[PDB]
Amino acid sequence: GVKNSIIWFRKGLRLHDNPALLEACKDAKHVYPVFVLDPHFLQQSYKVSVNRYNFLLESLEDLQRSFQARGSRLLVLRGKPEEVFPRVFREWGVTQLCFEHDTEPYAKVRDAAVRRLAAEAGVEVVTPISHTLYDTDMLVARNGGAAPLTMQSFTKLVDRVGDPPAPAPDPPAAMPPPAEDMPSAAPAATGVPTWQEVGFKEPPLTVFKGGETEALARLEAAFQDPKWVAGFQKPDTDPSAWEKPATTVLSPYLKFGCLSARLFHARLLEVYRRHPAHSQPPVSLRGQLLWREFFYTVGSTTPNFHRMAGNPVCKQIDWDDNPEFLAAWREARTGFPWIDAIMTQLVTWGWMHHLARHSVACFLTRGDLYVSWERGMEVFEEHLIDQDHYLNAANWMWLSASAFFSQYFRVYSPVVFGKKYDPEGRFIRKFLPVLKDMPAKYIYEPWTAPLEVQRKAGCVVGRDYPAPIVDHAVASKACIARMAAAYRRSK
């Protein structure tokens, strides 16, 4: 004989568009849905926010409910894959192990080791591509052996290849369950823990709930107005909108695979066929999935892509070791309310609009503080619920003019940028309530408010809210000079 399979979740935390799951179930007597949880992961070198970890746990709870509805259940195995799988292969009489391919660096090492162990145990391994739109190694190959290095050339490449594969069918309404009385499948050892049980001491504050069920609901909400979908232009959306965010907020769901990228793409093409004036890449909503695909393709084929040194696409720049500036930025006490409000949204929600990320990343790196993008990436990695190895690295290199982007004379203003969208400061007042009573005329520049106004607002600069840590005009002039010199050194 009979077929006993494992469907191993890592990303791809969904039942829809899951070719790995469909193969695991095919002709199977027993199917073991597995997630491998690392019970000491939170005891490391890298801190992880409860927001992101709890989003994962909610996503696993949703998978558990989906499998239970179909006569099965999710097995959250504790330990390391290379240690756990050899034992459960033999315990469960496994003949096939299926999982979605993952092109991240650690994934490649882990998966090579598991493939070796599967072969020793006589286990067939099936690893379909479905986290990305395309087989990104196929894209590189069709491009002549190297990844495109511009978004425009990347878009031309995928258009020559054609449409991404359609999303796979839904799985059957009933699934083969684990076998009975298998000790490694004992319910008490294989349940989804809570954030308290994994060791977090403060509760999650984010407003976006994990899981495939929420992902599909938010997909449908995005598609309730096909004219908005068709006309979407990313650079024209409003980073100060928080009650109704100006973009889809599907990124955490795409990061964890709660939402299929191929489903999203197929739904876009359906709308586009009915709206021939729809927006085109890069600014379109399909363009956004292509930004993701572009950075996955370059990132996966570039050594040390998430670092500066040893990264062949990355400019070597003489960033300052300035821990005081990094700390003020990380801790949302720069004294620029637009910046501090965005950094507070980072820690509270784990998600900000793309141009809000632009504002704070420019400020930290080539715009004002001249701190390395690697340090900014680490702070984002701790807190983002959509934290994505390749996307975070690529966008930090873009924003610091280290790769892909080189126009270091374009510097966002930490005062003016948000005011053009939100002159009343509704976003600032939401995330920085200490400023909730500051007249709009001063809310982006509270240090300019008369002391009488600061006192009446209950927000005295230097006491209740810090003074700005730099003069933007002075800081940006200095950073631009350093960037120019760094570019000349790389000649």
Between 161 and 283, CB nearer to Cl ion: 283
**Residue 30 interface partner, choices Cl ion, ligand FAD, none, CB cut-off 5-8 Å depending on type:** none
Residue 10 CA: distances (Å) to CA of 193, 255, 349: 16, 11, 23
Backbone phi, psi, residue 6, to 5°: -115, 130
- The C-alpha torsion from 213 through 218 and 221 to 222, rounded to 10°, is -140
- Does the protein bind Cl ion through residue 412 (CB under 5 A)? yes
Q: Is 190 annotated as a binding residue?
A: no
The radius of gyration computed from the CA coordinates of the chain, to the nearest angstrom, equals 24
List the one residue from 76, 250, 342, 371 that touches ligand FAD (CB under 6 A).
250
Contacts of 227 (CB under 8 A, 6+ apart): 275
- Does the protein bind Cl ion through residue 266 (CB under 5 A)? no
Q: Provide, rounded to whole angstroms, the least separation between the CB of residue 301 and ligand FAD.
A: 17
Residue 274: closest CA among 216, 220, 223: 223
Residue 444: closest CA among 337, 339, 290: 337
List the one residue from 399, 432, 461, 483 that touches ligand FAD (CB under 6 A).
399
- Does the protein bind Cl ion through residue 234 (CB under 5 A)? yes
Give the Cα separation of 399 and 295 in Å (integer): 14
Q: How many other C-beta atoms lie within 10 A of the C-beta of residue 288?
A: 22
- The C-alpha torsion from 99 through 102 and 108 to 110, rounded to 10°, is -50
Q: Is 251 annotated as a binding residue?
A: yes
Q: Which stretch binds ligand FAD (CB under 6 A): 195-203, 288-296, 411-419, 440-448?
A: 288-296
**Residue 282 interface partner, choices Cl ion, ligand FAD, none, CB cut-off 5-8 Å depending on type:** Cl ion
Using CB under 6 A as the binding criterion, the count of chain residues that bind ligand FAD stands at 28
Facing residues of 147 across strands? none
Q: Which stretch binds ligand FAD (CB under 6 A): 74-82, 113-121, 180-188, 291-299?
A: 291-299
Q: Provide, rounded to whole angstroms, the least separation between the CB of residue 157 and ligand FAD.
A: 17
Q: Which stretch binds ligand FAD (CB under 6 A): 18-26, 83-91, 241-249, 333-341?
A: 241-249
List the one residue from 74, 384, 435, 461 that touches ligand FAD (CB under 6 A).
384
Residue 67 CA: distances (Å) to CA of 13, 74, 428: 12, 7, 42
Q: Is 304 annotated as a binding residue?
A: no
List the one residue from 74, 391, 428, 479 that touches ligand FAD (CB under 6 A).
391
**Residue 34 interface partner, choices ligand FAD, Cl ion, none, CB cut-off 5-8 Å depending on type:** none
**Residue 395 interface partner, choices ligand FAD, Cl ion, none, CB cut-off 5-8 Å depending on type:** ligand FAD
Contacts of 319 (CB under 8 A, 6+ apart): 365, 370, 371, 372, 373
Give the single-character DSSP code of 407. -
List the one residue from 60, 229, 289, 461 that touches ligand FAD (CB under 6 A).
289
Give the Cα separation of 402 and 317 in Å (integer): 8
Between 76 and 362, CB nearer to Cl ion: 362
Give the Cα separation of 239 and 251 in Å (integer): 15
Residue ranges binding ligand FAD (CB under 6 A):
234, 247-251, 254-255, 288-289, 291-292, 295, 353-354, 357-358, 361, 380, 384, 386-388, 391-392, 395-396, 399
